[PDB]
Design a protein around this motif. Structure first.
Motif, PDB file in Angstrom:
ATOM      1  N   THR A   6       0.868  -1.170   0.000  1.00 55.63           N
ATOM      2  CA  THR A   6       0.000   0.000   0.000  1.00 55.63           C
ATOM      3  C   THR A   6       0.908   1.224   0.000  1.00 55.63           C
ATOM      4  O   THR A   6       2.108   1.109   0.261  1.00 55.63           O
ATOM      5  N   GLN A   7       0.364   2.391  -0.325  1.00 55.16           N
ATOM      6  CA  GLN A   7       1.187   3.591  -0.259  1.00 55.16           C
ATOM      7  C   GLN A   7       1.464   3.806   1.226  1.00 55.16           C
ATOM      8  O   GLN A   7       0.651   3.425   2.080  1.00 55.16           O
ATOM      9  N   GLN A   8       2.627   4.379   1.525  1.00 53.91           N
ATOM     10  CA  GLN A   8       3.045   4.653   2.899  1.00 53.91           C
ATOM     11  C   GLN A   8       1.982   5.379   3.691  1.00 53.91           C
ATOM     12  O   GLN A   8       1.483   6.415   3.250  1.00 53.91           O
ATOM     13  N   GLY A   9       1.667   4.841   4.867  1.00 62.07           N
ATOM     14  CA  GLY A   9       0.678   5.463   5.726  1.00 62.07           C
ATOM     15  C   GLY A   9      -0.748   5.026   5.479  1.00 62.07           C
ATOM     16  O   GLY A   9      -1.693   5.682   5.955  1.00 62.07           O
ATOM     17  N   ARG A  10      -0.898   3.946   4.714  1.00 59.13           N
ATOM     18  CA  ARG A  10      -2.213   3.405   4.380  1.00 59.13           C
ATOM     19  C   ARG A  10      -2.198   2.010   4.972  1.00 59.13           C
ATOM     20  O   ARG A  10      -1.426   1.163   4.540  1.00 59.13           O
ATOM     21  N   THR A  11      -3.043   1.766   5.964  1.00 59.09           N
ATOM     22  CA  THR A  11      -3.024   0.489   6.670  1.00 59.09           C
ATOM     23  C   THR A  11      -4.173  -0.515   6.588  1.00 59.09           C
ATOM     24  O   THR A  11      -4.152  -1.521   7.301  1.00 59.09           O
ATOM     25  N   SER A  12      -5.156  -0.274   5.730  1.00 59.62           N
ATOM     26  CA  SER A  12      -6.275  -1.202   5.633  1.00 59.62           C
ATOM     27  C   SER A  12      -6.708  -1.458   4.210  1.00 59.62           C
ATOM     28  O   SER A  12      -6.406  -0.692   3.298  1.00 59.62           O
ATOM     29  N   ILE A  13      -7.442  -2.546   4.042  1.00 59.27           N
ATOM     30  CA  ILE A  13      -7.988  -2.922   2.751  1.00 59.27           C
ATOM     31  C   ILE A  13      -9.476  -3.054   3.020  1.00 59.27           C
ATOM     32  O   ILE A  13      -9.869  -3.368   4.146  1.00 59.27           O
ATOM     33  N   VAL A  14     -10.306  -2.793   2.017  1.00 62.30           N
ATOM     34  CA  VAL A  14     -11.749  -2.938   2.188  1.00 62.30           C
ATOM     35  C   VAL A  14     -12.262  -3.946   1.165  1.00 62.30           C
ATOM     36  O   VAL A  14     -11.875  -3.905   0.000  1.00 62.30           O
ATOM     37  N   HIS A  15     -13.103  -4.875   1.603  1.00 62.62           N
ATOM     38  CA  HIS A  15     -13.655  -5.866   0.689  1.00 62.62           C
ATOM     39  C   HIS A  15     -14.956  -5.304   0.106  1.00 62.62           C
ATOM     40  O   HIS A  15     -15.991  -5.300   0.770  1.00 62.62           O
ATOM     41  N   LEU A  16     -14.890  -4.788  -1.120  1.00 61.97           N
ATOM     42  CA  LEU A  16     -16.075  -4.253  -1.777  1.00 61.97           C
ATOM     43  C   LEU A  16     -16.736  -5.445  -2.460  1.00 61.97           C
ATOM     44  O   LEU A  16     -16.736  -5.586  -3.683  1.00 61.97           O
ATOM     45  N   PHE A  17     -17.278  -6.309  -1.610  1.00 61.78           N
ATOM     46  CA  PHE A  17     -17.952  -7.551  -1.966  1.00 61.78           C
ATOM     47  C   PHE A  17     -19.041  -7.411  -3.042  1.00 61.78           C
ATOM     48  O   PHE A  17     -20.057  -6.737  -2.837  1.00 61.78           O
ATOM     49  N   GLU A  18     -18.809  -8.061  -4.183  1.00 61.77           N
ATOM     50  CA  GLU A  18     -19.724  -8.070  -5.332  1.00 61.77           C
ATOM     51  C   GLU A  18     -19.918  -6.731  -6.046  1.00 61.77           C
ATOM     52  O   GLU A  18     -20.847  -6.578  -6.837  1.00 61.77           O
ATOM     53  N   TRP A  19     -19.043  -5.766  -5.783  1.00 61.28           N
ATOM     54  CA  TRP A  19     -19.143  -4.470  -6.444  1.00 61.28           C
ATOM     55  C   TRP A  19     -18.686  -4.613  -7.889  1.00 61.28           C
ATOM     56  O   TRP A  19     -17.838  -5.454  -8.198  1.00 61.28           O
ATOM     57  N   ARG A  20     -19.259  -3.793  -8.767  1.00 61.61           N
ATOM     58  CA  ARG A  20     -18.903  -3.783 -10.184  1.00 61.61           C
ATOM     59  C   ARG A  20     -17.617  -2.978 -10.301  1.00 61.61           C
ATOM     60  O   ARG A  20     -17.373  -2.077  -9.494  1.00 61.61           O
ATOM     61  N   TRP A  21     -16.805  -3.287 -11.308  1.00 58.03           N
ATOM     62  CA  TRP A  21     -15.534  -2.589 -11.499  1.00 58.03           C
ATOM     63  C   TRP A  21     -15.682  -1.073 -11.642  1.00 58.03           C
ATOM     64  O   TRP A  21     -14.883  -0.315 -11.094  1.00 58.03           O
ATOM     65  N   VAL A  22     -16.699  -0.629 -12.376  1.00 53.50           N
ATOM     66  CA  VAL A  22     -16.902   0.804 -12.577  1.00 53.50           C
ATOM     67  C   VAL A  22     -17.235   1.535 -11.273  1.00 53.50           C
ATOM     68  O   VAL A  22     -16.868   2.696 -11.091  1.00 53.50           O
ATOM     69  N   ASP A  23     -17.913   0.856 -10.356  1.00 54.93           N
ATOM     70  CA  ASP A  23     -18.251   1.473  -9.078  1.00 54.93           C
ATOM     71  C   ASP A  23     -17.019   1.553  -8.179  1.00 54.93           C
ATOM     72  O   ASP A  23     -16.825   2.525  -7.454  1.00 54.93           O
ATOM     73  N   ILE A  24     -16.180   0.526  -8.228  1.00 54.36           N
ATOM     74  CA  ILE A  24     -14.962   0.517  -7.426  1.00 54.36           C
ATOM     75  C   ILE A  24     -14.029   1.608  -7.946  1.00 54.36           C
ATOM     76  O   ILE A  24     -13.386   2.312  -7.165  1.00 54.36           O
ATOM     77  N   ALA A  25     -13.963   1.753  -9.266  1.00 52.52           N
ATOM     78  CA  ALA A  25     -13.117   2.780  -9.864  1.00 52.52           C
ATOM     79  C   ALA A  25     -13.521   4.141  -9.298  1.00 52.52           C
ATOM     80  O   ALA A  25     -12.678   4.899  -8.829  1.00 52.52           O
ATOM     81  N   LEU A  26     -14.815   4.441  -9.337  1.00 55.07           N
ATOM     82  CA  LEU A  26     -15.329   5.706  -8.819  1.00 55.07           C
ATOM     83  C   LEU A  26     -15.073   5.827  -7.329  1.00 55.07           C
ATOM     84  O   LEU A  26     -14.673   6.884  -6.845  1.00 55.07           O
ATOM     85  N   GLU A  27     -15.305   4.736  -6.601  1.00 56.63           N
ATOM     86  CA  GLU A  27     -15.106   4.731  -5.157  1.00 56.63           C
ATOM     87  C   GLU A  27     -13.653   5.047  -4.803  1.00 56.63           C
ATOM     88  O   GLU A  27     -13.389   5.765  -3.839  1.00 56.63           O
ATOM     89  N   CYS A  28     -12.709   4.512  -5.573  1.00 60.60           N
ATOM     90  CA  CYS A  28     -11.298   4.790  -5.319  1.00 60.60           C
ATOM     91  C   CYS A  28     -11.027   6.292  -5.370  1.00 60.60           C
ATOM     92  O   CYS A  28     -10.362   6.847  -4.497  1.00 60.60           O
ATOM     93  N   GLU A  29     -11.565   6.939  -6.400  1.00 58.45           N
ATOM     94  CA  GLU A  29     -11.377   8.369  -6.627  1.00 58.45           C
ATOM     95  C   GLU A  29     -12.139   9.319  -5.707  1.00 58.45           C
ATOM     96  O   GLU A  29     -11.575  10.300  -5.219  1.00 58.45           O
ATOM     97  N   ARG A  30     -13.414   9.032  -5.472  1.00 63.54           N
ATOM     98  CA  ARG A  30     -14.250   9.902  -4.647  1.00 63.54           C
ATOM     99  C   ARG A  30     -14.186   9.663  -3.141  1.00 63.54           C
ATOM    100  O   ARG A  30     -14.451  10.579  -2.360  1.00 63.54           O
ATOM    101  N   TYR A  31     -13.827   8.454  -2.719  1.00 64.08           N
ATOM    102  CA  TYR A  31     -13.801   8.163  -1.288  1.00 64.08           C
ATOM    103  C   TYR A  31     -12.533   7.502  -0.730  1.00 64.08           C
ATOM    104  O   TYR A  31     -11.873   8.049   0.151  1.00 64.08           O
ATOM    105  N   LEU A  32     -12.207   6.320  -1.242  1.00 66.23           N
ATOM    106  CA  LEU A  32     -11.053   5.565  -0.771  1.00 66.23           C
ATOM    107  C   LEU A  32      -9.736   6.337  -0.743  1.00 66.23           C
ATOM    108  O   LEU A  32      -9.001   6.282   0.245  1.00 66.23           O
ATOM    109  N   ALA A  33      -9.433   7.063  -1.814  1.00 72.27           N
ATOM    110  CA  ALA A  33      -8.194   7.831  -1.858  1.00 72.27           C
ATOM    111  C   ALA A  33      -8.163   8.950  -0.803  1.00 72.27           C
ATOM    112  O   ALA A  33      -7.303   8.956   0.075  1.00 72.27           O
TER     113      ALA A  33
END
Ligand SMILES: *[C@@H]1O[C@H](CO)[C@@H](O)[C@H](O)[C@H]1NC(C)=O
Ligand SMILES: [Ca+2]
Ligand SMILES: [Cl-]
Ligand code: NA
Ligand code: NA
Ligand code: NA
Length: 496
Positions: A6-33
């Motif tokens: 993970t990038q330095q200072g990032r300590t968790s992973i989230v299981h986006l169970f059954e999420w579609r790729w396009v939603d995860i892509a958006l989630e990475c940009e709008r929330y996760l990051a």
């Protein structure tokens, strides 16, 4: 293999169970990051059997038909688009690798697959790979049924069919190579690691031979020589010849005892209580911290499908769940994975959920998009626990205190405990049937801190509870046993 990359200072992973790729892509940009999440565990990205009875169950994704990146979550292009966009904002992708088996031996032959590939379980033919009768363990397995019948026999556990799932001959270089081909393609386009599904069912040495064929991570996004993060799924509750430690030479292992025990102490089963958590970790018979992938619940056991049993806490037990996740994210033991689920019509009969098969929210079998409401929660029946303030803020808490030691532990001999992480964080819990009101040594610098469970630090102020730390590091905490969230957490970055 042991490092998440993970990038330095990032300590968790989230299981986006059954999420579609396009939603995860958006989630990475709008929330996760922006919220500091380290990465995402995605559902199996390879083509699986389309099961209609029951109707598109979540478990159909654990019955491979081929290695084509074509599923209900999206096609190959949408998958890579996701990995690229997520990596571009410093959020990693971890693939759930189902490499122990193909589909059920009894599944009807045809093209009832997520990408239309033909397959014939009966004749052992999966031409899209391709695999044939020579690539399965029919002859190797010694049980009368051909399936795993007795876990006290480590050999059949590895060479026979898990609940009838066609078992791949992982000792063959051909099979190892087809799996490596699938995994290297994923690595090359950017994935940072893998969850090795059903690892207890694979020989430690076979997994090792497959890992020997894997590349280093994509050199455009990762430092030279980076090896893919590996966490093997091994449900080891202690009473079998197979131990999760047998897999340490390949990478980390899922520590299913973690959620099981945390669930029993927080539910206060068998006289257990939070005061017992002072020596949480290896002291409880768990694997070494640096080999543990921990979690409160998983997609499997949140619906009674795996292990941990009836004690597992889930979003259904929202209040106690948040506290359990809070303790996990505050405690230094292991690498943390937080669950993100979808709501299903749970229906108990004789103590068992008859709808535990139900797949993700869908319209005619097409998975529904994740909608984001104004208050930042999700619609379309996606629970989005990772977006709950109490959980998201503890994900950040973990980042803030990373590297800091477990200190200043306190307990009332019952269920009111507290502890700090060096001089960067402090957390207090009250799971007793009465109020907690006491002055605790926090180990933190003097000042005013925002409790990140009840609120947030917003523009130089707090939206919830405020904690005042004096010059000696002491602070007063007051938590009612009737509080919405019976725990308080403060850290270096929530200080005014
Ligand atoms: C905090 O909120 C108060 C009003 O409640 C305001 O007077 C003050 O300037 C705010 N502080 C900052 C740093 O924005
Ligand atoms: Ca096997
Ligand atoms: Cl898991
Ligand atoms: Na690093
Ligand atoms: Na499994
Ligand atoms: Na190495």
């Amino acid at each position: 293999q042991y490092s998440p990359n993970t990038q330095q200072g990032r300590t968790s992973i989230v299981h986006l169970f059954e999420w579609r790729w396009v939603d995860i892509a958006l989630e990475c940009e709008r929330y996760l990051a922006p919220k500091g999440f380290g990465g995402v565990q995605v559902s199996p990205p390879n083509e699986n059997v389309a099961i209609y009875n029951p109707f598109r169950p979540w478990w159909e994704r654990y019955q491979p038909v081929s290695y084509k990146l074509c599923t209900r979550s999206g096609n190959e292009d949408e998958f890579r688009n996701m990995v690229t966009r997520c990596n571009n904002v410093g959020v990693r992708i971890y693939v759930d690798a189902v490499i122990n088996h193909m589909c059920g031996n009894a599944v009807s032959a045809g093209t009832s697959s997520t990408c239309g590939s033909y397959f014939n379980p009966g004749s052992r033919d999966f031409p899209a790979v391709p695999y044939s009768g020579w690539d399965f363990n029919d002859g190797k397995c010694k049980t009368g049924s051909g399936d795993i019948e007795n876990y006290n026999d480590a050999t059949q556990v590895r060479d026979c069919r898990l609940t009838g799932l066609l078992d791949l001959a992982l000792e063959k270089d051909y099979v190892r190579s087809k799996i490596a081909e699938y995994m290297n393609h994923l690595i090359d386009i950017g994935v940072a690691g893998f969850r090795l599904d059903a690892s207890k069912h694979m020989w430690p040495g076979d997994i090792k031979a497959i890992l020997d064929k894997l590349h280093n991570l994509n050199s455009n996004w990762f430092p030279a020589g980076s090896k893919p993060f590996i966490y093997q799924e091994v449900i080891d509750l202690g009473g079998e010849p197979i131990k999760s430690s047998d897999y340490f030479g390949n990478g980390r292992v899922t520590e299913f005892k973690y959620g099981a025990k945390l669930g029993t102490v927080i539910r206060k089963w068998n006289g257990e209580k939070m005061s017992y958590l002072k020596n949480w970790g290896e002291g409880w018979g768990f694997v070494p911290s640096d080999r543990a992938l921990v979690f409160v619940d998983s997609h499997d056991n949140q619906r009674g499908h795996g292990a941990g049993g009836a004690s597992i806490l889930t979003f259904w037990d929202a209040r106690l769940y948040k506290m359990a996740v809070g303790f996990m994210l505050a405690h230094p033991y292991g690498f943390t994975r937080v669950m993100s689920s979808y709501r299903w019509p749970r229906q108990f009969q004789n103590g068992n959920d008859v709808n535990d098969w139900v797949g993700p929210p869908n319209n005619n079998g097409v998975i529904k998009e994740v909608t984001i409401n104004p208050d930042t929660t999700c619609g379309n029946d996606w629970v989005c626990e990772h977006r709950w303030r109490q959980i998201r803020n503890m994900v950040i808490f973990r980042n803030v205190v990373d590297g800091q030691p477990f200190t200043n532990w306190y307990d009332n001999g019952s269920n009111q405990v507290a502890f700090g992480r060096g001089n960067r964080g402090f957390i207090v819990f009250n799971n007793d049937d009465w109020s907690f009101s006491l002055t605790l040594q926090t180990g933190l610098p003097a000042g005013t801190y925002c409790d990140v469970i009840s609120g947030d630090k917003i523009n130089g102020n707090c939206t919830g509870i405020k904690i005042y730390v004096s010059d000696d590091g002491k602070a007063h905490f007051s938590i009612s046993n009737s509080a919405e969230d019976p725990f308080i957490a403060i850290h270096a970055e929530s200080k005014l």
